[PDB]
C-alpha cells in the first residue's frame, strides 16, 4: 500500500472520490538492486518505463544520484538527464552521447579527513539542448556513513501529453533491508515540459575511492550500501479518503479482492453482514478505442442542392441521406443563400452529433410566400401543398435562381393546388387531377360552371418584382429513433484490438466490452443487435464490415457473504450460476448448494435457526 | 463563433429618444438570432424580444410589448433596439444575445452598455 | 408563460464540499421528437456577463470542468458541484427555452463558509 499520489489538484475535503488513474497495485511485485560491498554488486541495468515508475531508495550516504530517462541514449535521440552533483540539481534535454556505465564519484582522503567529489562519467557530448534548468548551489555531506538506512525517498515519473510530472516524498526510517510497511501520500513536485518519447532508463550513482581501494581506474573502487526498488504503473480504480485537512489518509484497491470490489461499489471503507453482489471475474479496462464512418463517402448534398430541375411544390421530392458523414459546411453562404432559420436544433453544434436518417425535402416557391414554410402558419401553400408539424426539428434552406427560371416568355411549368376538400396532414402529398366541386352541381369532370381545376400553373417573368420571383427551397428534417448508425458527423478513429477488456464506442454508441469474431450476419439495413436484456450485444463497424459481439466484462449471479468488518475481514462467496470455473479464485471449502457454488465456507451436518441466509435453504454464521 | 460588440454607454436626460446597436462580427453570421435582455442593479436578468436579421420577424414579450422597438439591418449585420421617449426608470444595463436557432440558449454575449437618466 | 423557482436563494458551503440548486419548473419541457430536456444553467461573476454552463441539462459546453455536473427529470432539476473551490462563488440562473418567451430563474449566490 505505498504511491497514493494526488491525481488531480481540484481541493476536495471529506469527499470519497471514485478515481480511474494509474496506480501501483496492491501487494505488487517490484525489484530490488543492491549496492553492496562486502560482491561489489554495483547495480545499475537500463530498466523499462512502462507507462511511469515507482521508485523507491533506501538510503544513509547519498549513492543514488540521479537517473537519465530516453529511447536509444545513443545521441541520436533526445534524453534527459536529471543529476545532483555535489553542488546544484542538474535537468537537461539534450542529445547525449551516453556512457554505457556512467558513474559519479567520490574521494576520500586520509591525511586529512574529507569526502569529495573528483569523476563526472555519464555523457560524451551533448550537442541540441531544447530544455535545461540549474538549481541554486547547495553543498552535500558526501560523508560515509556506517549505520543502517535512514532515509527512504519515494518518486512517481510519469509521461503524459508532453509533460514529465514528478511526484515525491521523504521519509525518516530505521531499518536494514526490504520495502518498509506503512502508508504516505507523494506530494506534486515538477512538471517538466520536454516533449520526448521516453521508453527506458537507467540509474546513475556514485563510488567511493580511497587508499583501501587499490587499482587502476576500472578496478580501484569500493561501492558504499544503498539500495532501490522499481515498480510499474497499471491502469485501475481506486477510492481515496481526503479527510477535513485535505490530505489522503486510506485507499482501497477497487480489484484486489471481492470485498474491496463491495467496498468500492458501496463507496465505504465498511462494511455491513449481508449479501453484496459484486460481479464475476472482473478485469478492469486497459484501453479505450472509438470507431467513426471512414472520412469519404459524403452526402450527396450536391445531388439535392446542385440539381438540374427541382419538382413544384404540389408533388415536391423527397430524398433520404443515411451512412455518411455529413459535414454541414452549407451554412456558409459559398452560394447564395436568402434564408438560414433551423429551429429546434443548433446547426453550429450540430455536427458533434450522430443523427438518424436526415430527410431533404425539396420544391419550387414564389417569393412571397417562403414565409408560409414554417410550424404554425395558415395559408394556401401551408394548407393545401406542404405542412409542417407543429414541433419542428429542421433546417429551412432558401434562394433565389432568377436567371434559371424565368424564360422570357415565361416559365408556366411551375404548378401549385389551389382548391382542396380539407387541409392536410402534416407531411402529406396529395396528387391529384379531380375537378373540384365547389357547389351543388354535378359537373362530371366538365370543368363548366361552379366547377374549376386544382391546379393553376405560375407566372414568372425576368422582367418583374421582387415579390413575384421564384425561390428554391430545401427543408432538411432531422429525425432520431434507433440504429443511429446512419449520418455522423466528421470525427477521427483508432485501431481495432480484439479479446481484452477495453472501452469502446462506435457510431456514438459507448461501452466497456470484450471484442470478438462473430458467425451473426446481419441484413444490410441494421447495425446493432440485442440480446434478451436489450443490451447491445452485436456490432457491425462501418469500416471493416464485421460483426463483433458485446461480452460485459462480468456474466453471471455473485454475492458476497460477511460476518460484519467489525468482526473480521474473512469473507465467503456465492456463485448463483456455477455448478462445482468462472469463479475469482478456488481456495477450499468449495460447497454446492441450489443457490450456486459457495467458496470459503465450511460445511456441517447441524442444523440450527438461520442466521445469514443464503437461500433454498441455506444459512450461514460465524462461529468456533 | 462570431463575437458581438455594443455600442457604447449613454447618457440621456428625460424625455430624448435612444438608440442602442449591437455590432455582429464574425463568420458563420447567416443564422443568428439577435436577442436583448437588460439588468436593473442587482437583479436577475428579463429577457426582452428577440429578431432575425434580415426576415426580420420580431418577438416581443408581453411586459415589454410595444414599450420599445427592436429592428435589425442585414447588410451591416447590426440590431437596434429604440426607445421613442425613455423615462427615469430605464437606467440599467443592456445586453445582446445571440442564438443560433430558435429554441436554442444563447451563448454569445456583448459586453453590454450601461443606461442612465437623471440631473 | 412558464414561471421557475430555484431554491434555496444564499447556500453557504465550505471549500471542498458539495453544493447542490434546485430548480423547479410549472411544466414539464420535454421534447417529444428527440426526448430531451429543455433547461440550461448558467454562471454570472459581478461585473461581467453570464456564461453558458449546462445545455440540455445533462451535457457540458467545451471547456467547463468535470466539477460541474447536472441531473434531473421531469419538471425537477438539480446542478451539482462536487467539489467546491475557490473561484466559484457567483450566481447561478435556470433557463428554460422550451416555447417563447424564455422565463429566467430567480438566481442562487454560492458563498465560502469560515
Known amino acids: 500500500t505505498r504511491g497514493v499520489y494526488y491525481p488531480d489538484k481540484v481541493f476536495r475535503s471529506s469527499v470519497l472520490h471514485s478515481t480511474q488513474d494509474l496506480f501501483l497495485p496492491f501487494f505488487s511485485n517490484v525489484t530490488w538492486f543492491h549496492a553492496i560491498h562486502v560482491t561489489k554488486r554495483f547495480d545499475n541495468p537500463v530498466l523499462p518505463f512502462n507507462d511511469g515508475v515507482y521508485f523507491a531508495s533506501t538510503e544513509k550516504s547519498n549513492i543514488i544520484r540521479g537517473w537519465i530517462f530516453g529511447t536509444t541514449l545513443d545521441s541520436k535521440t533526445q534524453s534527459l538527464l536529471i543529476v545532483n552533483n555535489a553542488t546544484n540539481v542538474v535537468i537537461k534535454v539534450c542529445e547525449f552521447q551516453f556512457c554505457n556505465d556512467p558513474f559519479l564519484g567520490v574521494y576520500y582522503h586520509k591525511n586529512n579527513k574529507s569526502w569529495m567529489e573528483s569523476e563526472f562519467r555519464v555523457y560524451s557530448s551533448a550537442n541540441n539542448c531544447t530544455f535545461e534548468y540549474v538549481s541554486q548551489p547547495f553543498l552535500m555531506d558526501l560523508e560515509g556513513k556506517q549505520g543502517n538506512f535512514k532515509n527512504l525517498r519515494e518518486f512517481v515519473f510519469k509521461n503524459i501529453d508532453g509533460y514529465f510530472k514528478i511526484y515525491s516524498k521523504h521519509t525518516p526510517i530505521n531499518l536494514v533491508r526490504d520495502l518498509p510497511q506503512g502508508f504516505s501520500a507523494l506530494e506534486p513536485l515538477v512538471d517538466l515540459p520536454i516533449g520526448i518519447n521516453i521508453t527506458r532508463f537507467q540509474t546513475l550513482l556514485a563510488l567511493h575511492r580511497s587508499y583501501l581501494t587499490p587499482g587502476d581506474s576500472s578496478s580501484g573502487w569500493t561501492a558504499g550500501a544503498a539500495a532501490y526498488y522499481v515498480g510499474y504503473l497499471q491502469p485501475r480504480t481506486f477510492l481515496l479518503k481526503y479527510n477535513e485537512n485535505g490530505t489522503i489518509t486510506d485507499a482501497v484497491d477497487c480489484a484486489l479482492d471481492p470485498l474491496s470490489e463491495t467496498k468500492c461499489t458501496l463507496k465505504s471503507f465498511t462494511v455491513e453482514k449481508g449479501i453484496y453482489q459484486t460481479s464475476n471475474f472482473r478485469v478492469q479496462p486497459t484501453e479505450s478505442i472509438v470507431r467513426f464512418p471512414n472520412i469519404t463517402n459524403l452526402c450527396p448534398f450536391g445531388e439535392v442542392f446542385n440539381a438540374t430541375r427541382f419538382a413544384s411544390v404540389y408533388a415536391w421530392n423527397r430524398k433520404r441521406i443515411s451512412n455518411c458523414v455529413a459535414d454541414y459546411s452549407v451554412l456558409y453562404n459559398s452560394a447564395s443563400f436568402s434564408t438560414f432559420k433551423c429551429y429546434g436544433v443548433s446547426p453550429t453544434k450540430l455536427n458533434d452529433l450522430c443523427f438518424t436518417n436526415v430527410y431533404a425535402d425539396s420544391f419550387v416557391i414564389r417569393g412571397d410566400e417562403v414565409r408560409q414554410i414554417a410550424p404554425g402558419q395558415t395559408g394556401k401553400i401551408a394548407d393545401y401543398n406542404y405542412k409542417l408539424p407543429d414541433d419542428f426539428t429542421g433546417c429551412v434552406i432558401a434562394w433565389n435562381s432568377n436567371n434559371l427560371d424565368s424564360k422570357v416568355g415565361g416559365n408556366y411549368n411551375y404548378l401549385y393546388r389551389l382548391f382542396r376538400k380539407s387541409n392536410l396532414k402534416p407531411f402529406e402529398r396529395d396528387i391529384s387531377t379531380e375537378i373540384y366541386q365547389a357547389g351543388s352541381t354535378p359537373c362530371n369532370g366538365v370543368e363548366g360552371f361552379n366547377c374549376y381545376f386544382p391546379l393553376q400553373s405560375y407566372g414568372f417573368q425576368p422582367t418583374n418584382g421582387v415579390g413575384y420571383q421564384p425561390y428554391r427551397v430545401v427543408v432538411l428534417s432531422f429525425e432520431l429513433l434507433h440504429a443511429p448508425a446512419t449520418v455522423c458527423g466528421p470525427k477521427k478513429s483508432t485501431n481495432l484490438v480484439k479479446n481484452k477488456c477495453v472501452n469502446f464506442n462506435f457510431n456514438g454508441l459507448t461501452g466497456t466490452g470484450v471484442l470478438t469474431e462473430s458467425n451473426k450476419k446481419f441484413l444490410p439495413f441494421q447495425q446493432f443487435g440485442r440480446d434478451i436484456a436489450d443490451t447491445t450485444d452485436a456490432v457491425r463497424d462501418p469500416q471493416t464490415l464485421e460483426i463483433l459481439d458485446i461480452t460485459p466484462c462480468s456474466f453471471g449471479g455473485v454475492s458476497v457473504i460477511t460476518p460484519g468488518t467489525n468482526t473480521s475481514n474473512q469473507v465467503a462467496v456465492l456463485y448463483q450460476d456455477v455448478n462445482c470455473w468462472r469463479v475469482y479464485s478456488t481456495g477450499s471449502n468449495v460447497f454446492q448448494t441450489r443457490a450456486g457454488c459457495l467458496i470459503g465456507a465450511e460445511h456441517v451436518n447441524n442444523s440450527y435457526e438461520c442466521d445469514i441466509p443464503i437461500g433454498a435453504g441455506i444459512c450461514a454464521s460465524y462461529q468456533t | 463563433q462570431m463575437q458581438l460588440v455594443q455600442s457604447g454607454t449613454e447618457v440621456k436626460k428625460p424625455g430624448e429618444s435612444l438608440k442602442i446597436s449591437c455590432k455582429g462580427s464574425?463568420?458563420?453570421?447567416?443564422?443568428?438570432?439577435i436577442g436583448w435582455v437588460r439588468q436593473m442593479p442587482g437583479k436577475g436578468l428579463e429577457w426582452m424580444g428577440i429578431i432575425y436579421p434580415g426576415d426580420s420577424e420580431t418577438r416581443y414579450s408581453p411586459s415589454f410589448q410595444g414599450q420599445v422597438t427592436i429592428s435589425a439591418d442585414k447588410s451591416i449585420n447590426t440590431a437596434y433596439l429604440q426607445w421613442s421617449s425613455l423615462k427615469a426608470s430605464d437606467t440599467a444595463i443592456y445586453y445582446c444575445?445571440?442564438?443560433?436557432?430558435?429554441?436554442?440558449?444563447?451563448?454569445?454575449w456583448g459586453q453590454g452598455t450601461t443606461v442612465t437618466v437623471a440631473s | 408563460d412558464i414561471q421557475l423557482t430555484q431554491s434555496p436563494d444564499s447556500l453557504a458551503v465550505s471549500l471542498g464540499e458539495r453544493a447542490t440548486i434546485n430548480c423547479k419548473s410549472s411544466?414539464?419541457?420535454?421534447?417529444?421528437?428527440?426526448?430531451?430536456?429543455?433547461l440550461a444553467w448558467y454562471q454570472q461573476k459581478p461585473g461581467q456577463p453570464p456564461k453558458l454552463l449546462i445545455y440540455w441539462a445533462s451535457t457540458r459546453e467545451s471547456g467547463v470542468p468535470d466539477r460541474f455536473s447536472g441531473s434531473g427529470s421531469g419538471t425537477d432539476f438539480t446542478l451539482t458541484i462536487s467539489s467546491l473551490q475557490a473561484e466559484d462563488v457567483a450566481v447561478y440562473y435556470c433557463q428554460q427555452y422550451y416555447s417563447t418567451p424564455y422565463t429566467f430563474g430567480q438566481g442562487t449566490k454560492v458563498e465560502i463558509k469560515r
Open positions: 411544466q414539464s419541457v420535454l421534447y417529444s421528437s428527440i426526448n430531451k430536456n429543455y
Open positions: 444575445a445571440g442564438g443560433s436557432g430558435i429554441s436554442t440558449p444563447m451563448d454569445v
Open positions: 464574425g463568420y458563420g453570421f447567416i443564422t443568428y438570432w
